[PDB]
Design an enzyme around this catalytic site. Structure first.
Site, short mmCIF file in Angstrom:
data_model
loop_
_atom_site.label_atom_id
_atom_site.label_comp_id
_atom_site.label_asym_id
_atom_site.label_seq_id
_atom_site.Cartn_x
_atom_site.Cartn_y
_atom_site.Cartn_z
CG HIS B 41 57.50 96.25 67.10
ND1 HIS B 41 56.73 97.18 67.78
CD2 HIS B 41 57.27 96.38 65.77
CE1 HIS B 41 56.01 97.80 66.85
NE2 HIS B 41 56.30 97.36 65.63
N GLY B 143 51.71 104.58 67.03
CA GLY B 143 50.52 103.85 67.41
C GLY B 143 49.85 103.14 66.25
CB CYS B 145 52.84 99.25 65.21
SG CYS B 145 54.28 100.34 65.02
N1 QGX Z 1 57.97 102.86 67.20
C1 QGX Z 1 57.90 102.09 65.95
C2 QGX Z 1 57.62 102.99 64.73
O1 QGX Z 1 58.54 103.53 64.11
N2 QGX Z 1 56.33 103.01 64.35
C3 QGX Z 1 55.61 103.99 63.65
C4 QGX Z 1 54.85 103.61 62.55
N3 QGX Z 1 54.45 104.42 61.56
C5 QGX Z 1 54.78 105.70 61.66
C6 QGX Z 1 55.50 106.26 62.74
C7 QGX Z 1 55.74 107.65 62.87
C8 QGX Z 1 56.37 108.15 63.98
C9 QGX Z 1 56.78 107.30 65.00
C10 QGX Z 1 56.58 105.95 64.91
C11 QGX Z 1 55.94 105.38 63.77
C12 QGX Z 1 59.14 101.23 65.71
C13 QGX Z 1 60.41 101.76 65.84
C14 QGX Z 1 61.53 101.01 65.53
C15 QGX Z 1 61.38 99.71 65.09
CL1 QGX Z 1 62.79 98.83 64.58
C16 QGX Z 1 60.12 99.15 64.99
CL2 QGX Z 1 59.91 97.50 64.51
C17 QGX Z 1 59.00 99.91 65.30
#
Ligand code: QGX
Ligand code: QGX
Ligand code: CL
Ligand code: CL
Lengths: 298, 301
Positions: B41, B143, B145
């Site tokens: 992603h 961040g 990820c």
């Molecule tokens: N922006 C990321 C996400 O949620 N990654 C985060 C990871 N851990 C914690 C998080 C806390 C707050 C914000 C983001 C976080 C995202 C959003 C949607 C999808 Cl479908 C994917 Cl694959 C990945």
């Protein structure tokens, strides 16, 4: 989201763990520059006389599969300093710090100079640590990371009869009324680290767990009379100031959170949990909560 | 003595964390040999989030679109490919700090250490278990990820997880290092909910054995139970069923303490019925389920 008991990344410390053998005793040593620090009980008591009888070749120091040549030895309080012919190429930026009760630190548990685990713990108000240690873990160190600088604060020495642990700073000075001699020693009655409980309640509010919040506030004196009664450490004006940023972030004044804590003590949790826990957690300092809820890296 | 939630030393994994940037997105990557693994992603735009066609998006990308930074050195991406939900960026330099490693897929109940990273920099290490609903109860911010879950096999690192996303309840979803998601999750912004979480029963029993090894015996009783009767009581408290495999895995702990598995099962039944009566087990007022039988043996012996 989430709140975990989180240790500092242990890499910078792993590159310093060596094995120290003297006779039949094998424990861990911390190799920084050309010096190896380890508990003085490895020579085992009259430690000064025992060390005078020792020669450099009596100490076998092993860093991975390389034997280090000990070229000098001296004692600083309860720590033995073994000078070696090679500076540790993995020596990080470091300081030796003495911590206060309530402060937390990561422990890198080692056996035979090999790191086996890393866990986060707090220096209890009775100066013991509720660690997880087996025979051979002596010399394992406690540390914090400040920007890109390792702050060594603890070296494991022994286990008290209750299972709690005792040790020294990196200058060999014991934390608490403990001595490194086989004699009956008991830890004093432990108390709860109040400022850390408040910091942990702020972390719960940041995570959306807010059932314990109430409309009430209290004076610092009224809170301390109640806290003293439940074996909780007094909360000083320094603690109120340190909780400031968390109070501003959550919108919950310190004395407002103190009244929540006051009720939690006099009434319990009513079958509810805070951050998946049925007990008030006291091993997260206000700095740990800020660091974890803001993502500070090392 | 003592019992702590203990993570593996993270050094071997820290030397693999790099920062991966594609357009306006910056996350973490795992640099092993000449390959950088990260969530696919990272190539997603704002419009391509609900139903992104990753094959189509990756075909439009060139090696120069991927900015990989390892410390203060920018790595040259010389190839890119996708394996399920993980992006593999070939680089012109092998990581000199590459440890001995394996990519392992774990089962619910299994535990692992997580090295939480931001901008390719390790900030914390904690212990986790893969929940029966295939989520992890982690501590992650935006961040994070690309942060990885691992275990250490003496000298070898078994990578088992790569963080991908946070579900609406705050729990986390991710994949093994081959890009296969754990659970019925997809790397799309579509509505996704974790199933009802349950307690890892075998881990609770392993933790009760750890408490007995540490001198905690107040919860012990003179009763034994059948595996079937224990499972009927356990499900009522949202506990996973205990299989004959779990009884066998608890064998060494049972031999070490002298308490049969079905004997400890009756102690667990009594604990679920009465609660703790203001008492604690290993400094905890709740039954802990993130210590496997293997973790208990390792930590106590
Ligand atoms: N922006 C990321 C996400 O949620 N990654 C985060 C990871 N851990 C914690 C998080 C806390 C707050 C914000 C983001 C976080 C995202 C959003 C949607 C999808 Cl479908 C994917 Cl694959 C990945
Ligand atoms: N051999 C050690 C010791 O008890 N170190 C251990 C550390 N942690 C945990 C232990 C668990 C079991 C056995 C030993 C443990 C020792 C003994 C007496 C004295 Cl006075 C000193 Cl300074 C040090
Ligand atoms: Cl602060
Ligand atoms: Cl059944």
């Amino acid at each position: 989201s989430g709140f975990r008991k989180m240790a500092f990344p242990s890499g910078k410390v792993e590159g310093c763990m060596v094995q120290v053998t003297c006779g039949t005793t094998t424990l861990n040593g911390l190799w920084l520059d050309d010096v190896v620090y380890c508990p003085r009980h490895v020579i085992c008591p009259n430690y000064e006389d025992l060390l005078i009888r020792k020669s450099n070749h009596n100490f076998l120091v092993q860093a991975g599969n390389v034997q280090l040549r000990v070229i000098g030895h001296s004692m600083q309080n309860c720590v033995l300093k073994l000078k070696v012919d090679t500076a540790n190429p993995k020596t990080p930026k470091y300081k030796f710090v003495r911590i206060q009760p309530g402060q937390t630190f990561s422990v890198l548990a080692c056996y035979n100079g090999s790191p086996s685990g890393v866990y986060q713990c707090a220096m209890r108000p009775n100066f013991t640590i509720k660690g997880s240690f087996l025979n051979g873990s002596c010399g394992s160190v406690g540390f914090n990371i400040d920007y890109d600088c390792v702050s060594f604060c603890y070296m494991h020495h022994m286990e008290l009869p209750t299972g709690v642990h005792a040790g020294t700073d990196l200058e060999g000075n014991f934390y608490g009324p403990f001595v490194d001699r086989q004699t009956a020693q008991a830890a004093g009655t432990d108390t709860t680290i109040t400022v850390n409980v408040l910091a942990w309640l702020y972390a719960a509010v940041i995570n959306g767990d807010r059932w314990f919040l109430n409309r009430f506030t209290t004076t610092l004196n009224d809170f301390n009379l109640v806290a003293m009664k439940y074996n909780y450490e007094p909360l000083t004006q320094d603690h109120v100031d340190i909780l400031g940023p968390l109070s501003a972030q959550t919108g919950i004044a310190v004395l407002d959170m103190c009244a929540s804590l006051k009720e939690l003590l006099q009434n319990g949790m009513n079958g509810r949990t805070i951050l998946g826990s049925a007990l008030l957690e006291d091993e997260f300092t206000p700095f740990d909560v800020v660091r974890q809820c803001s993502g500070v890296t090392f």
